[PDB]
């Protein structure tokens, strides 16, 4: 049916979503799950802040719809089409790039097609498991330990790291034969719904 999650709103804005939820029998909740159909983002006149419910909503190929969908529907006294209120961007993508759009559609071809991803080392604003769930949702396979990468030709190993959090290293290459990228690779790739070329995110691996 319809399950809504909400992001970046104030209490008085949450209340309007609540009103809208009651009028149209839409379950409204706090946490985002697979069962959620809609993510309601706060936007400007339709770019939003990159949030966890934003990445996960896109990762699930959901309706990542601007808060304007609600108030306009409240004002026009019926459920408007999500189509005309869907979010277009953030800071990885200004105004137009169609992150959520590529995603609602593409579910056949997922950006992390046949990939083995390892979120290695400490992580901060984005928990290891949230990045893992994100990465899984885009079609990848999660590896927990560097030595657990499949010894088979068909998959490509990637090591995702968040530099700031440690005090990972430049010595991952010493423990495995995988490209090591910064977590921004995952975040952008998901934001934009297009697998980013590892090139700009690769980290110095010391021989
Ligand atoms: Co290849």
In CATH terms, 107-205 corresponds, of 3.50.50.60, 1.50.10.20, 3.40.50.10190, 3.30.70.2660, to 3.40.50.10190
Of 139, 143, 101, 128, which is closest to residue 183 (Cα–Cα)?
128
For residue 156, the CA-to-ligand 1 centroid distance in Å is: 6
Which letter does DSSP use for residue 201 in this model? T
For residue 112, the CA-to-ligand 1 centroid distance in Å is: 13
Q: Is 200 helix (H, G, I), strand (E, B) or coil?
A: helix
For residue 170, the CA-to-ligand 1 centroid distance in Å is: 23
Q: Which CATH superfamily is domain 1-106 in?
A: BRCT domain (3.40.50.10190)
Question: How would you class 154 by CB atoms within 10 Å of its CB: exposed for 0-12, middle for 13-18, buried for 19 or more?
Answer: exposed
For residue 179, the CA-to-ligand 1 centroid distance in Å is: 12
Sign for the pseudo-dihedral over CA of 16, 57, 53, 200? negative
For residue 154, the CA-to-ligand 1 centroid distance in Å is: 8
For residue 155, the CA-to-ligand 1 centroid distance in Å is: 8
In contact, 146 and 169? CB cutoff 8 Å: no
Q: How far apart are CA 149 and CA 14, in angstroms?
A: 44
In b/e form, how buried is each residue of 116-145, taking b as 16+ CB within 10 angstroms? Answer: bbbbbbebeebebeebbbbbebbbbebbee
Of 48, 40, 51, 34, which is closest to residue 18 (Cα–Cα)?
40
Structural determination approach: X-ray
In b/e form, how buried is each residue of 59-84, taking b as 16+ CB within 10 angstroms? Answer: bbbbbbbbbbbbeebeeeeeebebee
For residue 178, the CA-to-ligand 1 centroid distance in Å is: 12
For residue 193, the CA-to-ligand 1 centroid distance in Å is: 20
For residue 203, the CA-to-ligand 1 centroid distance in Å is: 19
Resolution in A: 2.8
Q: How far apart are CA 97 and CA 64, in angstroms?
A: 14
Which letter does DSSP use for residue 38 in this model? E
Of 3, 10, 63, which is closest to residue 30 (Cα–Cα)?
3
- Bridge-based pairing state of the strands 27-28 and 180-182: unpaired
For residue 148, the CA-to-ligand 1 centroid distance in Å is: 19
For residue 116, the CA-to-ligand 1 centroid distance in Å is: 12
Domain boundaries of the chain, sorted by first residue:
1-106, 107-205
For residue 111, the CA-to-ligand 1 centroid distance in Å is: 14
- The reply to whether domains 1-106 and 107-205 share a CATH topology is yes
Q: How far apart are CA 82 and CA 66, in angstroms?
A: 9
For residue 174, the CA-to-ligand 1 centroid distance in Å is: 21
């Amino acid at each position: 049916r319809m399950s809504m999650v909400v992001s970046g709103l104030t209490p008085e804005e949450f209340m309007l979503v609540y009103k809208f939820a009651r009028k149209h029998h839409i379950t409204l909740t706090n946490l985002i799950t697979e069962e959620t159909t809609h993510v309601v983002m706060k936007t400007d006149a339709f770019v939003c802040e990159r949030t966890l419910k934003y990445f996960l909503g896109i990762a699930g190929g959901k309706w990542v719809v601007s808060y304007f969908w609600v108030t306009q529907s409240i004002k026009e006294r019926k459920m408007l089409n999500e189509h005309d209120f869907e979010v277009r961007g953030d800071v990885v993508n200004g105004r137009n790039h169609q992150g959520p759009k590529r995603a609602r559609e593409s579910q056949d071809r997922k950006i992390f097609r046949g990939l083995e991803i390892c979120c290695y080392g400490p992580f901060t604003n984005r928990p290891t498991d949230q990045l893992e769930w994100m990465v899984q949702l885009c079609g990848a396979s999660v590896v927990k330990e560097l030595s657990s990468f499949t010894l088979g030709t068909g998959v490509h190993p990637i090591v995702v790291v968040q530099p700031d959090a440690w005090t990972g290293f430049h010595a991952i290459g010493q423990m495995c034969e995988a490209p090591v990228v910064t977590r921004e690779w995952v975040l952008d790739s998901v934001a934009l719904y297009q697998c980013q070329e590892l090139d700009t995110y690769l980290i110095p691996q010391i021989p």
